[PDB]
Amino acid sequence: DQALSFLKDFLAGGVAAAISKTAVAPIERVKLLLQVQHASKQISAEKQYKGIIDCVVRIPKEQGFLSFWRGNLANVIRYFPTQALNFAFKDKYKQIFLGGVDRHKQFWRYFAGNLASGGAAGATSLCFVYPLDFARTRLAADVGKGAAQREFTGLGNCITKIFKSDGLRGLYQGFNVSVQGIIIYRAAYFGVYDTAKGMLPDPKNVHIIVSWMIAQTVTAVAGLVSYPFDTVRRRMMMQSGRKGADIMYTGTVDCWRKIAKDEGPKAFFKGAWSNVLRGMGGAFVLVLYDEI
Ligand SMILES: C=C1[C@@H]2CC[C@H]3[C@]4(C)C[C@H](O[C@H]5O[C@H](CO)[C@@H](OS(=O)(=O)O)[C@H](OS(=O)(=O)O)[C@H]5OC(=O)CC(C)C)CC(C(=O)O)(C(=O)O)[C@H]4CC[C@]3(C2)[C@H]1O
Ligand SMILES: CCCCCCCCCCCC(=O)NCCC[N+](C)(C)[O-]
């Protein structure tokens, strides 16, 4: 019950999360650039990154090797407020949406309860940490080659600059679709894993390896299914700071339509492969980390 033990666990978790996310930040930046460069003010269509390889080879000489971690501070910080918030809300939402439900005799009522609980805890946390996700994205998208060409010079600068021009709404652009995404993601994750645990994995006796790959596969699939929601989310974040006729999307719905009509249905998955890689590498660093 030691408050000390709890603090130690809390910090250790924050350290682990900070290491894995920092580790895959380069590939995450590529994912973000490909996903949002269409809505960038600095990237002309001619200078757009042609892909992962074209992207990884260009940013070092274009903006400096260190720029691979541009916007990563938000990544190492988010964990703390996020987990602090879960400590006060997470279990309460579970009790609220799942209390009294028999998991075995009421599959769907349980399923829905699970989604509402995850969705409620996620939206609640985001009410506080979303600006961090916002800045992580806007900084990642910034391709300035030096302090003078930087659209934002850092986490604090991004948040303050946007706040001054758009107020709070600017820092929360894309909030709603992100929550929809959280629910779709959770629905796909549990839906797949559920169907999975049935076929091929009897009382999990298989090697740790296959047991890991399977967990990664469920994550990748859940990430793909909800990816479109992530793309309009980030594209909306790119609107903050813009004014008048400069605004590409007037709302989430307008965003969905615009992307579909101006870029094509496949465009919703720009960066999706990079995202799959990012997720895998992230999980691989944690195991690599826990073993040291
Ligand atoms: C439209 C979308 C896409 C689909 C939904 C989300 C996540 C995948 C959704 C996700 O992560 C969520 O899903 C997990 C799996 O079901 C769930 O774990 S569980 O409780 O153990 O089941 C996490 O819960 S928490 O308890 O740890 O807090 C939950 O985190 C949140 O609620 C984090 C808030 C900051 C939002 C977190 C996250 C991640 O990459 O994994 C993260 O930022 O770290 C999001 C990335 C952004 C999108 C991508 C959003 O743009
Ligand atoms: C277990 C595998 C199931 C197969 C899943 C196949 C996913 C293909 C990705 C679909 C992307 C998606 O969700 N778009 C929802 C559009 C919703 N609106 C119209 C409101 O914008």
48, 90, 98, 102 from 116: Cα distances, Å = 39, 11, 9, 16
Structure tokens at 174: 């894309």
Q: Kindly state if the Cβ of 134 falls inside 6 Å of ligand 1.
A: no
Helix axes 73-98, 107-141, angle to 10 degrees: 160
Domain range spanning residue 14? Answer: 1-292
- How far is Cα 27 from Cα 44, in angstroms, rounded to an integer? 22
**Into how many domains does the chain fold?**
1
CA-based nearest residue to 120, from 189, 218, 76, 186: 186
- How far is Cα 228 from Cα 270, in angstroms, rounded to an integer? 9
- How far is Cα 184 from Cα 122, in angstroms, rounded to an integer? 12
Give the number of other CB atoms < 10 A from CB of residue 86.
Answer: 15
- How far is Cα 39 from Cα 262, in angstroms, rounded to an integer? 12
Structure tokens at 292: 């040291």
Gap between the terminal Cα atoms of the chain: 27
For 74, half-sphere exposure in the C-beta direction (CA atoms, 13 angstrom radius) is 24
Task: Say how many Å lie between the CA of residue 283 and the centre of ligand 1.
Answer: 14
Could you tell me how far CA 55 lies from the centroid of its own chain?
20
- How far is Cα 292 from Cα 59, in angstroms, rounded to an integer? 31
143, 250, 269 from 246: Cα distances, Å = 19, 10, 24
Confirm if 98 and 118 have CB atoms less than 8 A apart.
no
Pocket test for ligand 2, best of 182, 225, 227, 276 (most atoms within 8 A of CB): 225
φ/ψ of 94, rounded to 5, equals -65, -45
Could you tell me how far CA 121 lies from the centroid of its own chain?
15
Buried b (16+ CB within 10 A) or exposed e, 211-233: eeebeeebbbbbbbbbbbbbbbb
27, 123, 153, 169 from 51: Cα distances, Å = 12, 32, 25, 32
- How far is Cα 170 from Cα 242, in angstroms, rounded to an integer? 10
The coordinates were experimentally obtained by X-ray
- How far is Cα 160 from Cα 147, in angstroms, rounded to an integer? 17
Give the number of other CB atoms < 10 A from CB of residue 149.
Answer: 11
Annotated binding site for ADP: 78, 90, 233
- How far is Cα 284 from Cα 32, in angstroms, rounded to an integer? 20
- How far is Cα 259 from Cα 269, in angstroms, rounded to an integer? 11
Q: Which ligand is nearest to the CA of 230?
A: 1
- How far is Cα 94 from Cα 159, in angstroms, rounded to an integer? 32
SS3 annotation, the chain: CCHHHHHHHHHHHHHHHHHHHHHCHHHHHHHHHHHHHHHCCCCCHHHCCCCHHHHHHHHHHHHCHHHHHCCCHHHHHHHHHHHHHHHHHHHHHHHHHHCCCCCCCCHHHHHHHHHHHHHHHHHHHHHHHHHHHHHHHHHHHCCCCCCCCCCCCCHHHHHHHHHHHHCHHHHCCCHHHHHHHHHHHHHHHHHHHHHHHHCCCHHHCCCHHHHHHHHHHHHHHHHHHHHHHHHHHHHHHCCCCCCHHHCCCCCHHHHHHHHHHHHCHHHHHCCHHHHHHHHHHHHHHHHHHHCC
CA dihedral 34, 35, 41, 43 (to 10 degrees): 10
Give the number of other CB atoms < 10 A from CB of residue 60.
Answer: 13
Confirm if 289 and 16 have CB atoms less than 8 A apart.
yes
Q: Kindly state if the Cβ of 226 falls inside 6 Å of ligand 1.
A: yes
User: Where residue 274 sits, what CATH number does that domain have?
Assistant: 1.50.40.10
Structure tokens at 105: 């005799």
For the stretch 261-265, contacts whose Cβ atoms lie closer than 8 Å and that sit 24 or more positions apart, written own/partner, are 263/38
Task: Say how many Å lie between the CA of residue 274 and the centre of ligand 2.
Answer: 19
